[PDB]
């Protein structure tokens, strides 16, 4: 009993939030190449038998509603949950098209507390976003 | 009887705490490119942490930035696996 039970009828949802275009008022640049990522992830998780849902250019309000709604679905027949976030960010924060969302707010919808259908099941958050402004100069081998 | 409410979460970050993350406008982000390649090659063979460790190595060794701006040129990236999982995760069977 050292591995998660992954033989439920469904592997589970893979939610892909692909934020490429941001409201001009935010002053954030477009994230060229993120569509390549979103398509790569869609195909990859399709081959793993995840129910992939690709969402594009979501406001901060839409991200929170999406996470809330998804956490309230029936996950009883699903082995796991995956959420992929592709956006601008900083430490602890990912950006909707019009403003930031705390990562904690997103993940709290799925806490073993608030989403009983996923208690004991692996909840995977894959986050392509900045975590700050430091640069890694590397070192020679 | 109870488990922690924070148990069974895994956060696969593209980059280390405090750092920029790199995206290529033609190929996609370094992290997602590498993640998909390693899932493709190893999801039927390795446990997820070992898959994500191959992702770390791929990003760390095969990518380095090219920029006309010296400040952003020749930079590197390491992803950051944050595991509160309590079991091994295999995608097969």
């Amino acid at each position: 009993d050292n591995s998660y039970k992954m033989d439920y009828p469904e592997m589970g949802l893979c939610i892909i939030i692909n934020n490429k275009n941001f409201h001009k008022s935010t002053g954030m640049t477009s994230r060229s190449g993120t569509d390549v990522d979103a398509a790569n992830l869609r195909e990859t998780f399709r081959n793993l038998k995840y129910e992939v849902r690709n969402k594009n250019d979501l406001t901060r309000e839409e991200i929170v509603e999406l996470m809330r709604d998804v956490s309230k679905e029936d996950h009883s027949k699903r082995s796991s949950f995956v959420c992929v976030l592709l956006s601008h960010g900083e430490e602890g924060i990912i950006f909707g098209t019009n403003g930031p969302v705390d990562l904690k707010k997103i993940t709290n919808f799925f806490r073993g507390d608030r989403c009983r259908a996923l208690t004991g099941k692996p909840k995977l958050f894959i986050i392509q976003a900045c975590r700050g402004t430091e640069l890694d100069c590397g070192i020679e081998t | 009887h109870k488990i922690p409410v924070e148990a069974d979460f895994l956060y696969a970050y593209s980059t280390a705490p405090g750092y920029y993350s790199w995206r290529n406008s033609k190929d996609g982000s370094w992290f997602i490119q590498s993640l998909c390649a390693m899932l493709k090659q190893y999801a039927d063979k390795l446990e997820f942490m070992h898959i994500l460790t191959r992702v770390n190595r791929k990003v760390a060794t095969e990518f380095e930035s090219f920029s006309f701006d010296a400040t952003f040129h020749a930079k590197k990236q390491i992803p950051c696996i944050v595991s509160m999982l309590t079991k091994e995760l295999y995608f097969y069977h």
């Binding site: 994230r31 | 290529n24 406008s25 090219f66």
Partner: peptide
């Protein structure tokens, strides 16, 4: 290559 761009930071993002």
């Amino acid at each position: 290559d761009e930071v993002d």
